[PDB]
Amino acid sequence: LHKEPATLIKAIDGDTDKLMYKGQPMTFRLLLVDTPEFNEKYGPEASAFHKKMVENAKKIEVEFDKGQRTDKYGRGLAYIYADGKMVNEALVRQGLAKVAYVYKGNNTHEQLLRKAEAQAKKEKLNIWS
Numbered sequence: 664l665h666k667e668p669a670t671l672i673k674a675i676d677g678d679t680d681k682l683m684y685k686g687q688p689m690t691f692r693l694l695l696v697d698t699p700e701f702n703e704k705y706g707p708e709a710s711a712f713h714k715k716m717v718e719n720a721k722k723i724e725v726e727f728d729k730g731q732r733t734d735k736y737g738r739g740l741a742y743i744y745a746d747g748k749m750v751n752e753a754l755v756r757q758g759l760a761k762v763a764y765v766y767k768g769n770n771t772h773e774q775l776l777r778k779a780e781a782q783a784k785k786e787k788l789n790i791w792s
């Protein structure tokens with residue numbers, strides 16, 4: 664996989680942002696994770712964690728996997744990096760997202776993320792508390 668540029672337009676919630684990609688506004692949905700919706704337990708904490716990470720970043724990058732790049736709602740599907748750190752992984756590692764929506768052929772970083780999840784669960788963080 665390869666990283667590509669984007670800029671933040673607006674943080675939205677635990678697992679979506681509005682990014683400018685190739686000069687066009689798009690909603691992006693994080694691959695391989697699920698955060699609680701804002702109305703749900705740890706929802707606001709996930710939103711805030713994601714927001715801070717992408718707003719504080721000097722450089723945002725998107726990394727598409729090998730399969731589908733947009734979902735049925737027209738959202739981009741990517742791994743999102745904030746100054747080289749994967750937002751997807753960071754949410755999982757803090758117990759603010761579960762590994763989820765693992766579809767065959769768009770699952771390059773599955774094991775990386777499952778490792779993070781196991782460490783969050785061991786530490787009983789947030790969702791796992």
Ligand SMILES: Cc1cn([C@H]2C[C@H](OP(=O)(O)O)[C@@H](COP(=O)(O)O)O2)c(=O)[nH]c1=O
Binds near residue numbers: 692693696
């Ligand atoms: C993360 C992800 C979600 N989706 C679709 C499946 C789910 O469909 P449904 O809307 O029919 O449930 C929805 C979950 O996203 P959200 O967790 O953002 O709601 O988005 C994909 O199609 N591919 C993906 O990689």
Ligand SMILES: [Ca+2]
Binds near residue numbers: 697
């Ligand atoms: Ca969600």
